[PDB]
Amino acid sequence: LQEIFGNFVSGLIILFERPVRIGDTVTIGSFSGTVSKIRIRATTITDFDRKEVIIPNKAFVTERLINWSLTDTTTRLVIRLGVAYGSDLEKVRKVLLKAATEHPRVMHEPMPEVFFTAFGASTLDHELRLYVRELRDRSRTVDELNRTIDQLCRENDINIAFNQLEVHLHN
Amino acid sequence: RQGASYAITTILNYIIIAVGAMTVFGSLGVSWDKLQWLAAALSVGLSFGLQEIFGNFVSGLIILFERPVRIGDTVTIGSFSGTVSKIRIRATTITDFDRKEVIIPNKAFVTERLINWSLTDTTTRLVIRLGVAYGSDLEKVRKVLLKAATEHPRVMHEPMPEVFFTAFGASTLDHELRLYVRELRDRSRTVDELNRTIDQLCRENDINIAFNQLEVHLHN
Amino acid sequence: NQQTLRITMLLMFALFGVMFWAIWSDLITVFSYLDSITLWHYNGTEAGAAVVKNVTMGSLLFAIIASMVAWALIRNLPGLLEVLVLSRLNMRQGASYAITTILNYIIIAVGAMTVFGSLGVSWDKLQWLAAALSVGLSFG
């Protein structure tokens, strides 16, 4: 009876304070999905794999929630790229920024930026950050950006290199 | 709100079922002596939730008074890095760098360990790796690395940047550069600019950055 | 601006109405008329004697007024506090926010206490929720 009533009060505080609601992506302990029901002792989270998670009511109050969509539903996504050592670091930057600028689904107030953040064992690492408004636009945007980045890569002739290594042969 | 309607209909549902049960048990009359056994269970069930609420109340009060965390400062708790945006009952909102709001319970701030990035000076230090080939000098590389730090208008001077040679790598000697920055938001740009100018000076002074190497003893 | 002006006008109107009620000498009769009704059967202990009475309509009006003024004043707290605090050159990064929240919290507490006192059920309320309040304060 104490378990039932504790889950009762947990449901009540979830309904009043509202840290989570219906129709917003949320992850709790690496379980990402959209909340679909708030009832006694149980909250249903439809995972992206169509897998319903029945989270107990106390877990929402006690644990830590990653509420993807609480105020602005905005998110930011990053794109990796590896560049060969014997190439320029400005044509690559302009190529990367062209895709972000000429994409009708990339925001402008947090203007996209290009970073060169790592000296890789074989490729210099470039990182692109850009913001998106709609949550459902995340997956398509990465695909389109990668396709156009590869096209511009083979166009401007800047080499994306595979992991390399030198050999000192002696027979 | 997004689901205020759903919440209110559920609440009226719940009140209606409660009043119906109360009326039915009153009509049956057994509810007069029912305050013997189930009363203790109801008491502890309500006590758990009210104790949780009031404990989060006192946690919010001590957070507001002692102030280990505040509004507008980067903080990480259990690998959750972000800026605190609200301090309320039972919940503190941390906007993560990925625009992902973390609702941390109030007791966690008092009980767990906080990494408060900006508490007194907002200063931070950043490090840069570099790998250098074996058959090259270890002073031209040092001067090249220090030139970028010295001639960067965003690198502090009171904690003067230094260059270290701290590891004999399997294929490259490892050089590490430490330099301080005042503004927190300057961290990402500074690394990019420093890496670009370091690569430029690398191809200028002609000191080789080597890929992982290995020797082969062929026999056919 | 507009909110502060509205709050000041409400305060002035409330003061004028209180003065008129205490001056017109007819609101006292209206006070008696309001305090001469019954709504529910309440009980308690007064002066060491068990007294059971009824909920006067004046009590209900006072409770409603207290709830309304509490709800109006909780939202009027932050700007009226910040305008004064902003002139104090602050004392910390979020000391102003903390102090406005604290006054909010005290205001809601005093409003709840007044409302439950007006309803009169708070006299016997120290039976059940008292233990929960005790353990909640004890933990912290």
Coordinates of C-alpha atoms in Angstrom, one line a residue:
Chain A
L1 CA 0.0 0.0 0.0
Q2 CA 2.9 2.4 0.7
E3 CA 4.4 1.6 -2.7
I4 CA 1.0 2.3 -4.4
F5 CA 0.5 5.5 -2.5
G6 CA 4.0 6.7 -3.1
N7 CA 3.5 6.2 -6.8
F8 CA 0.2 8.1 -6.4
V9 CA 1.9 11.1 -5.0
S10 CA 4.7 10.9 -7.6
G11 CA 2.0 10.9 -10.3
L12 CA 0.4 13.9 -8.6
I13 CA 3.6 15.9 -8.5
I14 CA 4.4 15.0 -12.0
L15 CA 1.0 16.2 -13.1
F16 CA 1.3 19.5 -11.2
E17 CA 4.9 20.5 -11.4
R18 CA 5.2 19.1 -14.9
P19 CA 8.9 18.3 -15.5
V20 CA 7.7 16.0 -18.4
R21 CA 4.6 16.1 -20.5
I22 CA 2.9 14.4 -23.5
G23 CA 4.7 14.8 -26.8
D24 CA 8.3 15.6 -26.0
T25 CA 11.5 13.6 -26.5
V26 CA 13.2 12.6 -23.2
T27 CA 16.0 10.2 -22.2
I28 CA 16.3 8.6 -18.8
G29 CA 19.3 6.2 -18.3
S30 CA 20.0 5.9 -22.0
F31 CA 16.3 5.3 -22.8
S32 CA 15.4 7.9 -25.4
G33 CA 11.8 8.3 -26.6
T34 CA 8.6 10.3 -26.6
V35 CA 6.3 10.2 -23.6
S36 CA 2.9 8.9 -24.4
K37 CA 1.0 8.4 -21.1
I38 CA 1.2 9.5 -17.5
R39 CA -0.8 7.2 -15.2
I40 CA -0.5 5.6 -11.8
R41 CA 2.9 4.1 -11.1
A42 CA 3.7 4.0 -14.8
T43 CA 4.8 6.4 -17.5
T44 CA 5.1 5.0 -21.1
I45 CA 8.0 6.2 -23.3
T46 CA 7.7 5.1 -26.9
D47 CA 11.3 4.5 -28.0
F48 CA 12.5 5.3 -31.5
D49 CA 12.6 1.5 -32.1
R50 CA 8.9 1.3 -31.3
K51 CA 9.7 -0.1 -27.9
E52 CA 7.5 1.0 -25.0
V53 CA 9.3 1.7 -21.7
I54 CA 7.2 1.5 -18.5
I55 CA 9.1 3.8 -16.2
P56 CA 7.9 3.8 -12.6
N57 CA 6.5 7.0 -11.3
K58 CA 9.2 7.7 -8.6
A59 CA 12.0 7.5 -11.1
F60 CA 10.9 10.7 -12.9
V61 CA 11.0 12.7 -9.7
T62 CA 14.1 11.1 -8.2
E63 CA 16.4 10.5 -11.3
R64 CA 17.7 13.1 -13.8
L65 CA 15.7 13.8 -17.0
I66 CA 17.1 14.9 -20.3
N67 CA 14.1 16.9 -21.7
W68 CA 14.9 17.5 -25.3
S69 CA 11.9 19.7 -25.9
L70 CA 11.0 21.9 -22.9
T71 CA 11.3 25.6 -24.0
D72 CA 12.5 26.0 -27.6
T73 CA 12.6 22.4 -29.1
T74 CA 15.8 23.7 -30.7
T75 CA 18.9 21.4 -31.0
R76 CA 22.4 21.5 -32.4
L77 CA 24.1 18.9 -34.5
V78 CA 27.8 18.4 -35.3
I79 CA 29.5 16.9 -38.4
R80 CA 33.0 15.3 -38.4
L81 CA 35.4 15.5 -41.3
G82 CA 39.0 14.3 -41.8
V83 CA 41.4 16.1 -44.1
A84 CA 44.8 15.1 -45.4
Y85 CA 47.9 16.7 -44.1
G86 CA 49.2 18.2 -47.4
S87 CA 46.2 20.4 -48.0
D88 CA 45.0 23.9 -47.3
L89 CA 42.9 24.8 -44.3
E90 CA 40.8 27.5 -45.8
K91 CA 39.2 26.0 -48.9
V92 CA 38.0 23.2 -46.6
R93 CA 36.6 25.8 -44.3
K94 CA 34.7 27.6 -47.1
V95 CA 33.5 24.2 -48.5
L96 CA 32.1 23.2 -45.1
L97 CA 30.5 26.6 -44.4
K98 CA 28.8 26.6 -47.9
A99 CA 26.7 23.6 -47.1
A100 CA 25.5 25.1 -43.8
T101 CA 24.8 28.5 -45.3
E102 CA 22.9 27.2 -48.4
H103 CA 20.7 24.7 -46.5
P104 CA 17.1 25.9 -46.0
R105 CA 16.8 23.9 -42.7
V106 CA 19.8 25.5 -40.8
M107 CA 19.1 28.3 -38.5
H108 CA 20.9 31.7 -38.7
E109 CA 20.6 33.4 -35.3
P110 CA 23.1 30.8 -33.9
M111 CA 25.1 31.1 -37.0
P112 CA 26.9 27.8 -38.0
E113 CA 30.7 27.7 -37.3
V114 CA 33.6 25.6 -38.5
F115 CA 36.3 24.4 -36.1
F116 CA 39.7 22.7 -36.5
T117 CA 40.0 21.1 -33.1
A118 CA 42.3 18.1 -33.4
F119 CA 45.6 17.0 -34.9
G120 CA 44.7 13.4 -35.9
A121 CA 47.2 10.6 -36.2
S122 CA 46.5 10.6 -39.9
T123 CA 43.8 13.3 -40.7
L124 CA 43.3 16.8 -39.3
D125 CA 39.8 16.8 -37.7
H126 CA 37.3 19.5 -38.7
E127 CA 34.1 19.9 -36.7
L128 CA 31.0 21.7 -38.0
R129 CA 28.2 22.9 -35.6
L130 CA 24.8 24.0 -36.8
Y131 CA 21.4 24.5 -35.2
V132 CA 18.0 23.1 -36.2
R133 CA 14.6 24.1 -35.0
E134 CA 12.4 21.0 -35.6
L135 CA 13.4 17.9 -33.7
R136 CA 12.3 15.6 -36.5
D137 CA 14.6 17.5 -39.0
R138 CA 17.8 16.2 -37.2
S139 CA 18.3 13.0 -39.2
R140 CA 17.5 14.3 -42.7
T141 CA 19.7 17.4 -42.3
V142 CA 22.8 15.4 -41.5
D143 CA 22.2 13.2 -44.6
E144 CA 21.7 16.1 -47.0
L145 CA 24.7 18.0 -45.5
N146 CA 27.0 15.0 -45.8
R147 CA 25.9 14.4 -49.4
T148 CA 26.5 18.0 -50.4
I149 CA 29.8 18.1 -48.5
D150 CA 31.1 15.1 -50.3
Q151 CA 30.0 16.6 -53.6
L152 CA 31.9 19.9 -52.8
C153 CA 34.8 17.7 -51.7
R154 CA 35.2 16.0 -55.0
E155 CA 34.5 19.4 -56.7
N156 CA 37.0 21.7 -55.0
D157 CA 39.6 18.8 -55.0
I158 CA 40.4 18.6 -51.3
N159 CA 41.4 15.1 -50.3
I160 CA 39.8 13.1 -47.5
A161 CA 42.5 10.7 -46.5
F162 CA 42.5 7.2 -45.1
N163 CA 44.6 6.3 -42.1
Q164 CA 48.2 6.2 -43.2
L165 CA 51.5 4.8 -42.0
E166 CA 55.1 4.7 -43.1
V167 CA 57.1 1.5 -43.5
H168 CA 60.9 1.2 -43.2
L169 CA 61.5 -2.0 -45.3
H170 CA 64.7 -4.0 -45.2
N171 CA 65.2 -7.4 -46.8
Chain B
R1 CA 0.2 24.7 -21.6
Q2 CA 1.2 21.6 -23.7
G3 CA -0.8 19.2 -21.6
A4 CA -2.5 21.3 -18.9
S5 CA -5.9 20.2 -20.3
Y6 CA -4.9 16.5 -20.0
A7 CA -3.6 17.1 -16.5
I8 CA -6.8 18.9 -15.4
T9 CA -9.1 16.2 -16.8
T10 CA -7.0 13.5 -15.0
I11 CA -7.2 15.5 -11.8
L12 CA -11.0 15.8 -12.0
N13 CA -11.1 12.1 -12.8
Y14 CA -9.1 11.3 -9.7
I15 CA -11.2 13.6 -7.4
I16 CA -14.4 12.1 -8.8
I17 CA -13.2 8.5 -8.1
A18 CA -12.1 9.6 -4.6
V19 CA -15.5 11.2 -3.7
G20 CA -17.3 8.2 -5.2
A21 CA -15.3 5.7 -3.0
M22 CA -15.9 7.9 0.0
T23 CA -19.6 8.1 -0.6
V24 CA -19.9 4.3 -1.2
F25 CA -18.0 3.4 1.9
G26 CA -20.0 5.8 3.9
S27 CA -23.2 4.3 2.6
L28 CA -22.0 0.9 3.5
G29 CA -21.1 2.2 6.9
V30 CA -17.9 0.1 7.2
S31 CA -15.8 3.2 6.7
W32 CA -16.5 4.1 10.4
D33 CA -14.2 1.4 11.6
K34 CA -11.9 1.4 8.5
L35 CA -9.6 3.9 10.2
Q36 CA -8.0 1.1 12.0
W37 CA -5.9 -1.0 9.6
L38 CA -5.6 0.9 6.2
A39 CA -5.3 4.2 8.1
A40 CA -1.6 3.4 8.9
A41 CA -0.9 2.5 5.3
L42 CA -2.5 5.7 4.0
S43 CA -0.5 7.7 6.6
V44 CA 2.8 6.3 5.5
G45 CA 1.9 6.6 1.9
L46 CA 1.1 10.3 2.2
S47 CA 4.1 10.8 4.5
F48 CA 6.6 9.5 1.9
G49 CA 5.5 12.0 -0.7
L50 CA 5.1 14.9 1.7
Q51 CA 8.6 14.2 3.1
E52 CA 10.0 14.1 -0.4
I53 CA 8.4 17.5 -1.2
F54 CA 9.5 19.1 2.0
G55 CA 13.1 17.8 1.7
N56 CA 13.3 19.2 -1.8
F57 CA 11.9 22.5 -0.2
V58 CA 14.7 22.7 2.3
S59 CA 17.2 21.7 -0.4
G60 CA 16.0 24.6 -2.5
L61 CA 16.2 26.9 0.5
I62 CA 19.8 26.0 1.3
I63 CA 20.7 26.3 -2.4
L64 CA 19.3 29.8 -2.4
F65 CA 21.0 30.8 0.8
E66 CA 24.4 29.2 0.7
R67 CA 24.6 29.5 -3.1
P68 CA 27.0 26.8 -4.3
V69 CA 25.4 27.3 -7.8
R70 CA 23.6 30.3 -9.3
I71 CA 22.1 31.5 -12.5
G72 CA 24.5 31.9 -15.5
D73 CA 27.5 29.7 -14.8
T74 CA 28.7 26.5 -16.4
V75 CA 28.5 23.5 -14.2
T76 CA 28.8 19.7 -14.6
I77 CA 27.2 17.1 -12.4
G78 CA 27.8 13.4 -13.4
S79 CA 29.0 14.2 -16.9
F80 CA 26.1 16.6 -17.5
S81 CA 27.7 19.9 -18.5
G82 CA 25.6 23.1 -19.0
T83 CA 24.5 26.5 -17.8
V84 CA 22.0 26.7 -14.9
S85 CA 18.8 28.5 -16.0
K86 CA 16.3 28.1 -13.1
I87 CA 16.2 27.2 -9.4
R88 CA 12.8 26.2 -8.2
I89 CA 11.1 23.5 -6.0
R90 CA 12.6 20.1 -6.4
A91 CA 14.0 21.0 -9.8
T92 CA 17.0 22.9 -11.2
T93 CA 17.2 23.3 -15.0
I94 CA 20.6 22.9 -16.7
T95 CA 20.7 23.9 -20.4
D96 CA 23.2 21.6 -21.9
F97 CA 25.5 22.7 -24.8
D98 CA 23.3 20.6 -27.1
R99 CA 20.2 22.6 -26.0
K100 CA 19.0 19.7 -23.8
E101 CA 17.4 20.7 -20.5
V102 CA 18.4 18.6 -17.5
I103 CA 16.0 18.6 -14.6
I104 CA 18.2 17.8 -11.7
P105 CA 16.4 17.1 -8.4
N106 CA 17.1 19.6 -5.6
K107 CA 18.8 17.1 -3.2
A108 CA 21.4 16.2 -5.8
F109 CA 23.1 19.6 -5.8
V110 CA 23.6 19.5 -2.0
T111 CA 24.5 15.8 -1.8
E112 CA 26.6 15.2 -5.0
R113 CA 29.8 17.0 -6.1
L114 CA 29.6 20.0 -8.4
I115 CA 32.1 21.2 -10.9
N116 CA 31.5 24.9 -10.9
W117 CA 33.3 26.2 -13.9
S118 CA 32.6 29.9 -13.1
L119 CA 32.6 30.6 -9.4
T120 CA 35.4 33.2 -8.7
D121 CA 37.4 34.1 -11.8
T122 CA 35.7 32.4 -14.7
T123 CA 39.2 31.7 -15.9
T124 CA 40.1 28.4 -17.5
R125 CA 43.2 26.7 -19.1
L126 CA 43.3 24.7 -22.3
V127 CA 45.9 22.3 -23.6
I128 CA 47.0 21.5 -27.1
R129 CA 48.6 18.2 -28.2
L130 CA 51.2 17.8 -31.0
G131 CA 53.2 14.9 -32.3
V132 CA 56.7 15.4 -33.7
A133 CA 58.9 13.0 -35.7
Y134 CA 61.9 11.4 -34.1
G135 CA 64.6 12.8 -36.4
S136 CA 63.9 16.4 -35.7
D137 CA 65.1 19.1 -33.2
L138 CA 63.3 19.9 -30.0
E139 CA 63.8 23.6 -29.9
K140 CA 62.5 24.9 -33.2
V141 CA 59.3 23.0 -32.3
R142 CA 59.2 24.7 -28.9
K143 CA 59.7 28.2 -30.4
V144 CA 57.0 27.5 -33.0
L145 CA 54.5 26.3 -30.4
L146 CA 55.3 29.3 -28.1
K147 CA 55.0 31.8 -30.9
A148 CA 51.3 31.0 -31.4
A149 CA 50.5 31.4 -27.7
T150 CA 52.5 34.7 -27.4
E151 CA 51.0 36.4 -30.5
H152 CA 47.4 35.5 -29.8
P153 CA 45.3 38.4 -28.5
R154 CA 43.1 36.0 -26.5
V155 CA 45.8 34.3 -24.4
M156 CA 46.5 35.6 -20.9
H157 CA 49.9 36.6 -19.7
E158 CA 50.0 36.5 -15.9
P159 CA 49.8 32.6 -16.1
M160 CA 52.3 32.7 -19.0
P161 CA 51.8 29.9 -21.5
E162 CA 54.4 27.1 -21.3
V163 CA 55.5 24.3 -23.6
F164 CA 56.1 20.7 -22.4
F165 CA 57.7 17.6 -23.8
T166 CA 56.0 15.0 -21.6
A167 CA 56.0 11.7 -23.5
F168 CA 58.1 9.4 -25.6
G169 CA 55.5 8.1 -28.0
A170 CA 55.6 4.8 -29.9
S171 CA 56.0 6.8 -33.1
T172 CA 55.9 10.6 -32.2
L173 CA 57.3 12.6 -29.4
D174 CA 54.4 14.3 -27.6
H175 CA 54.5 18.0 -27.0
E176 CA 51.8 19.6 -24.8
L177 CA 51.0 23.3 -24.7
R178 CA 49.1 24.9 -21.8
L179 CA 47.6 28.3 -22.0
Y180 CA 44.9 30.3 -20.0
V181 CA 41.8 32.1 -21.2
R182 CA 39.6 34.5 -19.3
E183 CA 36.2 34.3 -21.0
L184 CA 34.5 30.9 -21.0
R185 CA 33.0 31.3 -24.4
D186 CA 36.4 32.0 -25.9
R187 CA 37.6 28.4 -25.3
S188 CA 36.5 26.8 -28.6
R189 CA 37.6 29.6 -31.0
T190 CA 41.0 29.9 -29.4
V191 CA 41.8 26.2 -29.9
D192 CA 40.8 26.5 -33.6
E193 CA 42.9 29.6 -34.3
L194 CA 45.9 28.2 -32.4
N195 CA 45.8 24.9 -34.3
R196 CA 45.5 26.7 -37.6
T197 CA 48.5 29.0 -36.9
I198 CA 50.5 26.1 -35.5
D199 CA 50.0 24.1 -38.7
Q200 CA 51.0 27.1 -40.7
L201 CA 54.2 27.6 -38.7
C202 CA 54.7 23.8 -39.0
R203 CA 54.8 23.9 -42.7
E204 CA 56.8 27.1 -42.6
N205 CA 59.7 26.2 -40.3
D206 CA 59.7 22.6 -41.8
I207 CA 59.3 20.5 -38.8
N208 CA 57.6 17.2 -39.6
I209 CA 54.5 15.9 -37.9
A210 CA 54.8 12.2 -38.4
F211 CA 52.2 9.5 -38.8
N212 CA 52.4 6.2 -36.8
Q213 CA 55.4 4.2 -38.2
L214 CA 56.6 0.6 -38.1
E215 CA 59.5 -1.4 -39.5
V216 CA 59.0 -4.6 -41.5
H217 CA 61.6 -7.4 -41.8
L218 CA 60.6 -8.9 -45.1
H219 CA 61.7 -12.3 -46.3
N220 CA 60.3 -14.1 -49.3
Chain C
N1 CA 5.9 50.5 -15.5
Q2 CA 2.2 49.6 -16.1
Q3 CA 2.4 46.7 -13.6
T4 CA 4.0 48.9 -10.9
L5 CA 1.4 51.7 -11.6
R6 CA -1.4 49.2 -11.3
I7 CA 0.0 47.8 -8.1
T8 CA 0.3 51.3 -6.6
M9 CA -3.2 52.2 -7.7
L10 CA -4.6 49.0 -6.1
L11 CA -2.7 49.7 -2.9
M12 CA -4.1 53.3 -2.8
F13 CA -7.6 52.1 -3.5
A14 CA -7.4 49.5 -0.8
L15 CA -6.2 52.1 1.7
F16 CA -9.0 54.5 0.7
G17 CA -11.6 51.7 1.0
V18 CA -10.4 50.7 4.4
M19 CA -10.5 54.3 5.6
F20 CA -14.0 54.7 4.2
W21 CA -15.2 51.5 5.9
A22 CA -13.7 52.6 9.2
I23 CA -15.1 56.1 8.6
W24 CA -18.5 55.7 7.0
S25 CA -19.7 53.7 10.1
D26 CA -22.0 51.7 7.9
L27 CA -19.5 49.0 6.9
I28 CA -19.4 48.0 10.6
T29 CA -23.1 47.2 10.2
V30 CA -22.2 45.5 6.9
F31 CA -19.5 43.6 8.8
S32 CA -22.1 42.4 11.3
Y33 CA -24.4 41.4 8.5
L34 CA -21.7 39.4 6.8
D35 CA -20.7 37.8 10.2
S36 CA -24.3 36.7 10.8
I37 CA -24.6 33.6 8.6
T38 CA -23.7 29.9 8.6
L39 CA -22.0 27.7 6.1
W40 CA -20.6 24.6 7.8
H41 CA -20.2 23.2 11.3
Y42 CA -16.7 23.8 12.8
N43 CA -15.4 22.9 16.2
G44 CA -12.4 23.8 18.3
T45 CA -11.1 24.9 21.7
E46 CA -11.3 28.5 22.8
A47 CA -10.3 29.8 26.2
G48 CA -9.9 26.2 27.4
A49 CA -13.5 25.4 26.5
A50 CA -14.7 23.2 23.7
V51 CA -16.8 25.5 21.4
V52 CA -18.6 24.4 18.2
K53 CA -19.8 27.1 15.8
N54 CA -20.7 27.7 12.2
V55 CA -18.8 29.2 9.3
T56 CA -20.0 32.8 9.0
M57 CA -20.4 34.4 5.6
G58 CA -18.1 37.1 6.8
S59 CA -15.5 34.4 7.3
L60 CA -15.9 33.1 3.8
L61 CA -15.7 36.7 2.4
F62 CA -12.5 37.3 4.4
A63 CA -11.0 34.0 3.2
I64 CA -11.8 34.8 -0.5
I65 CA -10.3 38.3 -0.1
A66 CA -7.2 36.9 1.5
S67 CA -6.8 34.4 -1.3
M68 CA -7.3 37.0 -4.0
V69 CA -4.9 39.5 -2.4
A70 CA -2.3 36.7 -2.0
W71 CA -2.5 35.7 -5.6
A72 CA -2.3 39.3 -6.7
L73 CA 0.7 40.1 -4.5
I74 CA 2.8 37.0 -5.2
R75 CA 3.0 38.2 -8.8
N76 CA 3.5 41.8 -7.8
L77 CA 6.5 40.9 -5.7
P78 CA 9.4 40.5 -8.2
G79 CA 9.3 43.8 -10.1
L80 CA 8.6 45.9 -7.0
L81 CA 11.5 44.1 -5.3
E82 CA 13.9 44.4 -8.3
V83 CA 13.3 48.1 -8.8
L84 CA 14.6 48.7 -5.3
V85 CA 17.3 46.1 -5.5
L86 CA 18.6 47.4 -8.8
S87 CA 19.2 50.7 -7.1
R88 CA 21.3 48.8 -4.5
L89 CA 24.0 47.9 -7.0
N90 CA 23.3 44.2 -6.2
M91 CA 25.4 42.0 -3.9
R92 CA 26.1 38.8 -5.9
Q93 CA 25.4 37.1 -9.2
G94 CA 21.9 36.0 -8.3
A95 CA 21.3 37.4 -4.8
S96 CA 18.4 39.5 -6.2
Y97 CA 16.7 36.5 -7.7
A98 CA 17.2 34.5 -4.5
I99 CA 15.7 37.3 -2.4
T100 CA 12.7 37.7 -4.6
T101 CA 12.1 34.0 -4.5
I102 CA 12.4 34.0 -0.7
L103 CA 9.8 36.8 -0.4
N104 CA 7.6 34.9 -2.8
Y105 CA 7.8 31.8 -0.6
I106 CA 7.2 33.7 2.6
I107 CA 4.2 35.4 1.0
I108 CA 2.6 32.2 -0.1
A109 CA 3.2 30.7 3.3
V110 CA 1.6 33.5 5.2
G111 CA -1.3 33.5 2.7
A112 CA -1.9 29.8 3.2
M113 CA -1.7 30.2 7.0
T114 CA -4.2 33.1 6.9
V115 CA -6.6 31.2 4.6
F116 CA -6.6 28.1 6.7
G117 CA -7.0 30.2 9.9
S118 CA -10.0 31.9 8.3
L119 CA -11.5 28.5 7.4
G120 CA -10.8 27.4 10.9
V121 CA -9.9 23.8 9.9
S122 CA -6.2 24.5 10.7
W123 CA -7.0 24.1 14.4
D124 CA -7.4 20.3 14.0
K125 CA -5.0 20.1 11.1
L126 CA -2.1 19.5 13.5
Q127 CA -3.1 15.8 13.6
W128 CA -2.2 14.2 10.3
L129 CA -0.1 16.5 8.2
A130 CA 1.9 17.6 11.3
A131 CA 3.9 14.4 11.3
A132 CA 4.7 14.8 7.6
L133 CA 5.8 18.4 8.2
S134 CA 7.9 17.3 11.2
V135 CA 9.8 14.6 9.3
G136 CA 10.2 16.8 6.2
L137 CA 11.8 19.5 8.4
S138 CA 13.8 16.9 10.3
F139 CA 15.5 15.5 7.2
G140 CA 16.8 18.9 6.2

